[PDB]
Amino acid sequence: RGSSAGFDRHITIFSPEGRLYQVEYAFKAINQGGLTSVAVRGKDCAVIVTQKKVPDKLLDSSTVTHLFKITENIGCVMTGMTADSRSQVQRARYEAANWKYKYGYEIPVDMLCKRIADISQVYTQNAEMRPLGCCMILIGIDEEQGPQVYKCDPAGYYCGFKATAAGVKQTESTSFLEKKVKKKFDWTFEQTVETAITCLSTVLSIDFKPSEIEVGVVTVENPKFRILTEAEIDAHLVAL
Amino acid sequence: SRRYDSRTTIFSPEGRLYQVEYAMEAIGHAGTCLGILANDGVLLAAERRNIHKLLDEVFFSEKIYKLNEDMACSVAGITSDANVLTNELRLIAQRYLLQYQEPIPCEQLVTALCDIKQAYTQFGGKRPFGVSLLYIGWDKHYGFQLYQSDPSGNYGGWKATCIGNNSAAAVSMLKQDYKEGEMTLKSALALAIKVLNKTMDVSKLSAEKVEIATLTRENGKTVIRVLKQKEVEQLIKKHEEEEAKAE
Amino acid sequence: RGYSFSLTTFSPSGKLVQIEYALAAVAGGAPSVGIKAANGVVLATEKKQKSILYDERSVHKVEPITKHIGLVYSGMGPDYRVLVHRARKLAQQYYLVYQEPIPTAQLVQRVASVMQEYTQSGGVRPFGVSLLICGWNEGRPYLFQSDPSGAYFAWKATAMGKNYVNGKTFLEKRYNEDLELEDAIHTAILTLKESFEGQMTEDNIEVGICNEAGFRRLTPTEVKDYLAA
Amino acid sequence: GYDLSASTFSPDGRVFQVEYAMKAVENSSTAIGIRCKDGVVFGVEKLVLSKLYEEGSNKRLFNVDRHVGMAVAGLLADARSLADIAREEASNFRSNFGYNIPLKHLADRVAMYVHAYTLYSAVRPFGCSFMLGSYSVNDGAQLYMIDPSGVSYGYWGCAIGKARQAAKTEIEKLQMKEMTCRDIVKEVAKIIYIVHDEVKDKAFELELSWVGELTNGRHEIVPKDIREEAEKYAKESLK
Amino acid sequence: SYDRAITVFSPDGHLFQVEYAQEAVKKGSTAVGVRGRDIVVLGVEKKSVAKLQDERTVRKICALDDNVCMAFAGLTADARIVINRARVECQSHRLTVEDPVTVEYITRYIASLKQRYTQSNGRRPFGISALIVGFDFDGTPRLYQTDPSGTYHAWKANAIGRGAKSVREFLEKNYTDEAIETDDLTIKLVIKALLEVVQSGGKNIELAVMRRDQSLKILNPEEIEKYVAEIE
Amino acid sequence: DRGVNTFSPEGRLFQVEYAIEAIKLGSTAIGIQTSEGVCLAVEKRITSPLMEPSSIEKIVEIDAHIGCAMSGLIADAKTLIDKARVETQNHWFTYNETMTVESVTQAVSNLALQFGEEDADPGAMSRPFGVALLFGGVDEKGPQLFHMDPSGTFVQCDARAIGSASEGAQSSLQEVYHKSMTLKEAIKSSLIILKQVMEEKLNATNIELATVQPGQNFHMFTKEELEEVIKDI
Amino acid sequence: NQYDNDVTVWSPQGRIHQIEYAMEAVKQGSATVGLKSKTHAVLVALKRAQSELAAHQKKILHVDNHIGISIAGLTADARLLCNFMRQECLDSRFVFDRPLPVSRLVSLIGSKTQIPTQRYGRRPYGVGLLIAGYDDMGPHIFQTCPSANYFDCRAMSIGARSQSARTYLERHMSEFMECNLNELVKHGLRALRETLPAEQDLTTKNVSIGIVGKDLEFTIYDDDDVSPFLEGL
Amino acid sequence: TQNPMVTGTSVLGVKFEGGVVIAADMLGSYGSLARFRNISRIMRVNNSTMLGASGDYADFQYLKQVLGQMVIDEELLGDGHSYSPRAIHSWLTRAMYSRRSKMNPLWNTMVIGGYADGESFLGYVDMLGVAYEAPSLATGYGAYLAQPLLREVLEKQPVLSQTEARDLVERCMRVLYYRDARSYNRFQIATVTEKGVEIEGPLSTETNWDIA
């Protein structure tokens, strides 16, 4: 089963069964932070709710965030190692800029995901560097496809999803979402936030308070990435 | 990093390059490839290893490759490395024809490749090429010539040589059957079937399981021709008849 | 910088284990099938998602390289995406010089060259993906396989990934030299079906076809029709 | 052997070379930083190993720009190296954009250079953690701390070193948001004196710096007179 | 570029990679060189005749230039690289000085290269020892030896490769003004020296002579047989 | 395991300490500095009668006023003696003056320790030089003798013995050396100590002696002159 | 064990053993003392002779008219740093036509000596230096370490048995500021003596003195020039 | 710059007892056209040194940023040392020569005036690396119209007060306005003393007489 021969588990090389243990250990890093992220797409909206844990009252909470703006219309939720995460947020922000400069139009969210996944794959084929222990869930509005939730992983794998989750409770969140979407999808409507807030709330048994979660949203009406304020998040939490 | 380096280009306590020796063991598990020099021409007879029924024949040959208009080569070892070395052999030949405007002499082409092979065995930190090539050709200095090269970068001219599986047994039979100075491509294309019928223990030569190429000079032009399966089948048939007659 | 030493080296028995291990990753990949008929080639792959939360129309396993050349794979999809880009860039470099579509055999050789480099270069592992390339050129259909070692093979019908040996045995008993692309599409679906485990659907499988018109990926709707019969 | 390179994750998802690098910062004396409404005051417990050392040797409070100051902990050689990086990043920002670099941008850019030393085996993670602090009329007071991993966060009061936890309890008993720099300097001195362990750590020189409306947005060392009043208050409070 | 140190000192001050190279030279065929008065003779053991092998392609005696020629023991592939470097060097010398290289000039260059491969990153020492023999413009017969370490010395007669000690012991007791007065006597000295190691005798012994102001001459198998019988 | 530049727990550098052991396996070379000049003597250590003793060069000339005695890996020295000769000629071309012996010893000792495998250079040295050098010359300061080791350390020595029997010739040297000693007395003292340490019987062909004197240039004694001194020895 | 052969490997306790090893090399060097008054900075070095017939070695060096250095550790690494310091001082007097502030030079050395301690395949510098210079900020004595850390010192001793000297310096440091050059030089000589093998004395052959001040360019007093200072102890 | 663009005219300098004074017009001309008429061609390098520049204004804007950072870099060390007026002059000579040798010159003639250690510094630097120190300096057409007058006064009375120096500078500025066609009647006067560098705002030679 877990056969090893050589530096199979120290550098990115195939195990006797072709497994690449180093990438597998980079997926264990995503769960070392302790936080879970949930992203759901609706009929005209894509939402990214993440768990916010400000451990000390001395830390400025305005600086403790996992939601990022790659471009005015592309938003990101990063789960895993914080410093590795800020590195990929920067590479995404740069690849998105270089795209508009060379092609003249904003990068599609699928195209940003593929570029980041292609760079991540090179860390899996070269032994000089470790893979990055972070997952990026990107959300945007495509002009011909509407709401788009895409996720890339430390292995170089990217895919589009109706709803996704990353972190410690990724599996439990997947099951919660893999039942609502089956019945009638994440009830399409900007109130698709309720599905995400309830998914994170249920898996991480907790009644979130306006300051314990961060919510980012992109809509066909307002396509620009927006981070909801505690008052807006409180409105949704009070509604449910 | 010194920890993950294998140190391929280094000596052993007994003055031995083990990466080169291990690569040579790889060559000894590949399809038998035999070369016989005759007075009228030179021949290469390889054992086909891709013999599945769902394989499509889409090329001139699988083991034989034309490198010039007067030179051809068969390979035994790692196919991927052979594709690299055959492409380099073709460029060395074209680069010489550009500088002098004459076809490259055969030993000059073999030396160029063996110089590249030897460099991977002394410096670079990379594995050697696990491919031994049998080269056949004609030049206006020595005429029809057969050569063999090894992963060590060491080459040698031969009258008859074999590389691959059961190669030693073949060299033995060629040694007791080759008549230097009295070999015609007919008797050469005959000893080939005899050696292959012994080296290839897998049943009897089946024509689909073997490839035969001949280099001859016809009207001041070198012609390399891979014998058609009909011709190979006739050869295998004659060998069976002869063996039965001697019984 | 980076490691300049080969991570793939010869073992005492004369074998490169790293490529053997890359072929283990190719055999643990999802089942893939290729059939060269007389009027075209069909490339079919099992595309089963882990959940209903995956957009099946987001990422594709059957991908076009030129307009006559298409590819499928079995192994690591991230490593496949690298080889798809290089195949397209090599195919364009050919057109820029000879101003003609690249022969499928020339594309397989050029791609196989890149794969062999990752077995002898320094600091890099071999590609854990075997590719099936289909192309139409000179009014003839071509089907070739490419191994992680850099070795390429021409096939009339072949299977890769899980249950590839049993799949090749099925294709050996079903493949007929005189077939049409439509009959070929059925046999390819049957081969994947033998090793599918579930209900093959227009979204559980992905099929691509190459003909005189060129390469294309059968729409989920078109595949729905074939699965019906 | 999963802990010999920063290019290797353990079978659990951890890079132990970076955890070992931060053990070096926890073996250093404490450096505390407190943000108020008027700006930021930095304080360091500079242990004096040899009495044959001039006053000010091995200083751990640096001026990375006219408006930015850097407190450091762990290896001083690595820390001095990152001060050069911060000084160069600020210089190039002023030459390219033509203004004083925002502390968040300076923090983000330095944190990325630190994180670049946590991915390859050709280099070792930095063995130092630092706090960058600044004050501008448009941005106000800002305090950011960077760790050997390369994580940067903004704080109201941070503490790096061997007594970070005890120092944090003391800093958390303060209403910095309402206090001013002139009043914070005495509190920084009180905490550094309360966290210092004379029984083990022999003697130390209290180092104090600040940037604020009083310094007109300029990082500077607290005037000797103000530092002395602070130390007298500190010792008296310990009583 | 791979820049690891292959050749490094060991406790006790031993460069083992250089010692391993000399072990390869000891596994090589025996090469013998006798410096006479008007003839320098170089003879090599043709290990196995092979029977089906063109000898013109496996010759271990080569000519670096019109006045210089060398024999080698050890790896044949490393030797071809060294011979080509020395051949190019002799021509570059004739172009920058307009005179034939001296036997020791080329011996010094071959040694200096064989040395840099023992103190350069990413390289393994050359597993070959050479016997550079020629005639200086003054007309002095010259015999030099190079080691995988880059060390070179002049000799009246030496032997390299398998059975070097035995052959050199023989040459130590059989070298004299007497066994060097006649060109034929010089040739039979090398022949007898190899016959001490060579088992076949005559059939498995290549030999070459470079008389003054004359090109290298490869003695034909019949000529070698003539001396082998006279030496019996 | 350990790379070329790794310090020992005693902070010594292993490759530099194994190169010093490499010298202990070299032919003994003695150097004595007197007011009347400097004498350099070495043991040829011939291996076979068929070898040409002249081919063994252990005392070389860097310039008309500077000679060098080597012990250890002789091939390693070739590159070091080449640097010394070029540096002396470069000093002449630039300043039209003879280079001092300390300046030549400092220029060569700087090439030592300039080794490593971390892409230090395209033609970087991989290991230390396993050779010890005894530079003897006459500058504006008079007869001077300096000793350089594989550690890059150079010292001015009045009398110094390097090689296999240094741990014995140095004791004999410190028992027979007087600042007022003449060059002739020094030359005889070198041969006497060498004859003792040498395993073979000292003769005019198994030893090499050279001298740099205030007015005369570097002079390698020929068999005739060597025989005269060896007669008294 | 596996944490003490590279400088890019932190130990499980947050320590680079290779820097600790390189720091051992300096403690394995002849003691060197350095003290400063209000106007002068003196460097006293205990030269060590390899043999009774060998010059000591030269432990004090010139960098610029206002700066001089005493060495402890590998002399080759010391020369490499001395050249970097000499060029940085030449560059300063060529661009600003002003002597380089001594404090700023120490900052440059610590930056150059830190790089090799964080890169794979590179070794820490194995030289501890006591720098003495005069500037618009008065006399300065600094001590550099192989770890790349440097310290502004009122007085310092680096080398073997240097704790004996640092004990004397700590006891008498109070009177050094208001001291004449000869009183200051004799204080340093006394401390260097406290680092001498019991039965040993400070002769003119085993001692060197370097001095710099408001009106004195760095001077290295050796041989007889040390007799004035030694006479009176 | 191989081709100067917007340029400035003459800059004057005179050392007095207690410091130095520099004067320049507030105008940048585009080949005869007074295009930018409210620009300062004077700069406070530090508290002891001031710099006035003639020639390409973009080349001066480049020097203000490079010398400005060089001073910020030094004042971050807190070592107690600072660039002196003479050290700034040495750096500028090295910079102008370095660029002239690369054949990419900074088209600028600078006057560096400083005060340190009770000594007044006034140095001249051209684009070819020619530099010297003198009791008075006048770049451009002031070399032919203002320097003659300043040199006459500084010959009879070698040492001038601040009141005398300013009077003579204002007199030389008037003659430069009457006879320099690239001049302007708005100027700034900078004074370096023990108090530091002070720059006076838009001053006018309006004290012009036109008896035509």
Author numbering:
A (entry chain O): 3 to 242
B (entry chain Q): 2 to 248
C (entry chain P): 3 to 231
D (entry chain U): 6 to 244
E (entry chain R): 2 to 233
F (entry chain S): 9 to 241
G (entry chain T): 4 to 236
H (entry chain b): 1 to 212
Task: Provide the authors' own sentences about this structure as they appear in the paper.
The proteasome plays an essential role in protein degradation and is critical to maintaining cellular protein homeostasis. The mammalian proteasome core particle, 20S, is a large, barrel-shaped protein complex composed of four stacked heptameric rings, including two inner β-rings flanked by two outer α-rings that are each formed by seven different α or β subunits. In each α-ring, the N termini of the α subunits form a gate preventing unregulated protein entry and degradation. There are three types of known endogenous proteasomal activators that bind the 20S to open the α-ring gates.
Selecting the β4-StrepII cell population, which had the highest knock-in efficiency, we expanded this cell line and purified the human proteasome by StrepII pull-down. To visualize what might happen if proteolysis was blocked, we purified proteasome complexes via 20S(β4-StrepII) by StrepII pull-down in the presence of the peptide-like inhibitor MG-132 and carried out cryo-EM analysis. Besides the 20S proteolytic chamber, additional density is also observed in both antechambers, indicating that MG-132 can diffuse into all inner chambers of the 20S proteasome. Within each inner chamber, the hydrophobic MG-132 shows a distinct localization to hydrophobic 20S inner wall areas. Furthermore, the distribution of MG-132 shows connected densities leading to the proteolytic sites on β1, β2, and β5, which are also observed in the ALFA peptide density and suggest possible routes of peptide movement from the antechamber into the proteolytic chamber. Inhibition of proteolysis by MG-132 does not inhibit diffusion of peptide-like molecules within the proteasome, indicating that proteolysis is likely decoupled from substrate movement in the proteasome.
